[PDB]
């Protein structure tokens, strides 16, 4: 096991985040995708967090 | 010599009453001079932060007793308004480089809310001694009638030093000690009103009173 849990914090300022596993060794670059934010009800960009 | 001898008279350890300090200081009337007053207010405030510096101007009630030339720079017929009101010097907007080209011994700031022609070199030609005026002090306005009397009154600025230590002229010994105490109260209230946006502890850490050739005494 080398994949460790990360959470994709939102970018609308609300408190909402997904969680996933990311190989921090071979992918030092941070993730950012477009995911659904059910608080504001819109497809916003989710940035990488702790 | 005499300063070392009167070191016995001075009691710098003990802080002293507002009027007891003047009682001590007036016994030094043996100096061969006018013996002016050289108060030093010592506030508690950190000078490095910009917001914690104060530079105002207040009109002392009983005056200073010493006068200097007042120079007013007007863009147009502004430099002649004091010529009919007692202004020491009038400078024209077309005479910005010739306002004090020969002599600069004119300790009066320039107030002209309409003529903004002459300022001076931007590089301590009129910015090192404070020749650049602004309405924050109080002189920035197009009404010179008030400033004509304010120059004779001697509205003293609050020159904030490297650690909040300010001096002024407070009605030299020839003025009565009651007038001196009135000046003290009027300056203390003014600076208390002047207190900056951030303050801690006690604002006024100390006050000392002295003479150009006369030793210093606490004020409390």
């Amino acid at each position: 096991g080398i994949r460790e849990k990360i959470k994709l914090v939102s970018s609308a300022g609300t408190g909402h985040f997904y969680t996933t596993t990311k190989n921090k060794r071979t992918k030092p670059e941070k993730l950012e995708l477009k995911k659904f934010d059910p608080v504001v009800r819109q497809h916003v960009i989710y940035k990488e967090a702790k | 010599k005499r300063m070392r001898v009167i070191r016995e008279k001075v009691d710098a350890t003990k802080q002293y009453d507002i009027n007891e300090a003047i009682a001590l200081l007036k016994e030094l009337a043996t100096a061969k001079f006018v013996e002016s007053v050289d108060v030093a207010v010592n506030l508690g405030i950190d000078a490095r932060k910009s917001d914690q510096n104060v530079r105002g101007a207040t009109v002392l009630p009983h005056g200073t007793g010493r006068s200097v030339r007042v120079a007013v720079f007007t863009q147009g017929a502004n430099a002649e308004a004091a010529k009919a009101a007692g202004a020491e010097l009038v400078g024209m907007e077309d005479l910005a480089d010739q306002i004090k080209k020969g002599e600069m011994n004119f300790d009066v700031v320039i107030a002209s809310p309409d003529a903004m022609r002459v300022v001076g070199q931007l590089g301590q030609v009129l910015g090192p001694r404070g020749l650049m005026p602004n309405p924050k002090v109080g002189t920035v306005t197009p009404n010179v009638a008030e400033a004509v009397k304010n120059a004779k009154a001697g509205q003293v600025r609050y020159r904030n030093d490297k650690n909040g230590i300010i001096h002024t002229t407070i009605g030299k010994v020839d003025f009565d000690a009651d007038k001196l105490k009135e000046n003290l109260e009027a300056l203390l209230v003014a600076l208390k009103k002047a207190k900056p946006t951030q303050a801690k502890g006690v604002y006024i850490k100390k006050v000392s009173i002295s003479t150009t050739m006369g030793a210093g005494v606490a004020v409390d």
């Binding site: - | 910009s50 510096n53 104060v54 309409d114 931007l122 650049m132 309405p135």
Partner: protein, 552 residues
């Protein structure tokens, strides 16, 4: 009592592999304290500096500065603008005062205008009447005219592209300093400075209070200023009070004791393994508790991450008598003459150390030798047997988005050094880049590791006229001595440019000393023989320092 500027409490740090470069470092700092941080390339010194300056908060534990202290952080490789000039780069540092003057002149324009004269002023100018006072925006001109003298900055018209390596660090130092800060955190502040600048900086640092945490591999630099030493060996923080000479013996003692304890633990593990493997002897116990104790005894310990050893240098084509002579060389940039009427001839099988001030043409010489430039007079005459291999002065030529192995080899399972091929993995492993440490991206590399990798990548041409431009950039003591012993065995010719004369004292056989007016003089021998020459034809002149200072 009182004091206590900065604190760290149980400040761990975990890297993607798994190890903890920092774990359980709890310590505090005091006003007017100088700390020198030691360690090896990979110990975590630069990460600790970043944490202490507060760049990264991905720690476990706490890291607090006392409020109202200004922190000046000098990183490993400061990044500037290749478009800017020295004037517009330094002018950025004092930013609240340039805008203060500009806005004050604009308000001097707008105040006589009768439009909102009592609204546009009392709210806006008042916020500046003290920004021009506390920071003193009026006298920045004389402040800069004085502060330029001490560092002896390049000319104002100079461009960053035209700027040389040492002058770039000088400019960055001025920019960082001008804030007048209390905490001064520097990571290898003297990478490119010469004797004059280094002595000046290590006098100013000792004078300047507010606590200074400095990363340094230089014993002599550290000794003058450091009052405390932080070790930072293998995820532990060892504080030592003394000097470098006293601390080195304690470090050696610690290593010896750890090795002895390692051997004792090994022997115990053998002895218990024999009992574990013995029989049963009837219907008796065999001691499940003893088994559990033995199983617990099988722990792990970290070998010192890089006790790097002698590097690899593959020699190439045989070289004859002609070693690229130079005749009547003259160089200039506009009117600024660097070298005039230079003529010499390197012998065969020699090492030539080049010494001189900053921006005196040392890199320019390699530039014109490698064909990048042209000589304004004379000619350099290469030998036809000569193979060229010149190391760039700057690490900033790799691509940070590539792995170590890919960057060095080129994505080939077998590459070639010189003429014989040998596998790329082995070629990199010869530079102490083990299989595990193979996988880190070259953007995720310490200064010393980056230097080692860049050297390894460039030295694969298999040439024999090695033009090294400061290989001693970010090298530890052992890393330096590995290359220092490998170079003495080089068959081909080696031309080396450096500022630390102690490295050259062991390897240099010919000397190129720069001087004023653009005077470059050749010499045959080592530095002790150079001193002998000076003493035989001497001159009484020792009045080097003047201590210009910064503030009036």
């Amino acid at each position: 009592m009182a004091q206590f500027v900065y604190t760290m409490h149980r400040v761990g740090k975990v890297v993607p592999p798994k190890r903890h470069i920092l774990k359980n470092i709890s310590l505090s700092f005091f006003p007017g304290a100088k700390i020198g941080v030691l360690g090896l390339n990979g110990a975590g010194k630069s990460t600790l500096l970043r944490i202490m300056a507060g760049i990264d908060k991905d720690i476990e534990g706490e890291a607090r500065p006392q409020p109202d202290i200004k922190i000046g952080y000098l990183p490993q490789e400061p990044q500037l603008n290749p478009e800017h000039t020295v004037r517009e780069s330094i002018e950025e540092a004092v930013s609240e005062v340039v805008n203060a003057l500009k806005r004050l002149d604009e308000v001097y324009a707008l105040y006589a205008d009768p439009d909102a004269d009592f609204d546009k002023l009392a709210a806006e100018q008042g916020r500046l009447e003290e920004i021009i006072q506390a920071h003193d925006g009026h006298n920045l001109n004389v402040q800069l005219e004085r502060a330029a003298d001490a560092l002896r900055l390049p000319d104002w018209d100079a461009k960053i592209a035209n700027l040389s390596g040492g002058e770039r660090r000088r400019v960055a130092l001025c920019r960082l300093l001008l804030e007048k800060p209390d905490m001064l955190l520097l990571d290898q502040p003297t990478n490119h400075l010469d004797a004059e600048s280094v002595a000046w900086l290590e006098r100013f640092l000792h004078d300047f209070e507010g606590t200074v945490v400095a990363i340094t591999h230089d014993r002599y630099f550290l000794d003058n200023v450091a009052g405390w030493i932080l070790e930072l060996d293998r995820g532990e923080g060892i504080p030592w009070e003394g000097n470098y000479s006293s601390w080195l013996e304690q470090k050696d003692q610690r290593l010896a004791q750890e090795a002895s304890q390692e051997a004792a633990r090994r022997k115990s593990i053998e002895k218990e393994l024999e009992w574990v493997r013995q029989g049963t002897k009837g219907r008796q116990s065999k001691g499940k508790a003893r088994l559990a104790r033995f199983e617990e005894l099988n722990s792990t310990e970290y070998q010192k991450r890089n006790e790097t050893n002698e590097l690899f240098i593959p020699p190439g084509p045989r070289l004859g008598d002609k070693v690229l002579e130079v005749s009547n060389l003259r160089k200039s940039y506009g009117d600024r003459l660097l070298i005039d009427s230079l003529s010499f001839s390197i012998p065969k099988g020699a090492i030539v150390g080049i010494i001189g001030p900053n921006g005196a043409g040392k890199s320019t010489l390699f530039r014109m030798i490698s064909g990048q430039e042209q000589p304004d007079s004379g000619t350099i005459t290469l030998g036809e047997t000569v193979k060229l291999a010149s190391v760039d002065q700057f690490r900033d030529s790799m691509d940070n988005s590539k792995t170590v192995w890919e960057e060095v080899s080129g994505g080939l399972d077998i590459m070639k050094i010189g003429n014989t091929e040998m596998p790329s993995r082995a070629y990199v492993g010869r530079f102490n880049f083990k299989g595990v440490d193979q996988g880190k991206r070259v953007g995720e590399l310490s200064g010393g590791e980056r230097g080692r990798l860049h050297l390894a990548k460039l030295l694969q041409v298999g040439g024999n006229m090695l033009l090294l431009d400061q290989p001693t950039n970010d090298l530890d003591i052992e890393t330096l001595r590995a290359l220092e012993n490998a170079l003495l065995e080089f068959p081909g010719c080696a031309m080396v440019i450096s500022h630390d004369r102690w490295f050259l004292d062991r390897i240099a056989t010919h000397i190129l000393d720069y001087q004023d007016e653009g005077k470059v003089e050749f010499f045959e021998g080592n530095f002790t023989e150079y001193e002998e020459y000076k003493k035989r034809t001497l001159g009484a002149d020792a009045l080097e320092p003047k201590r210009i200072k910064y503030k009036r």
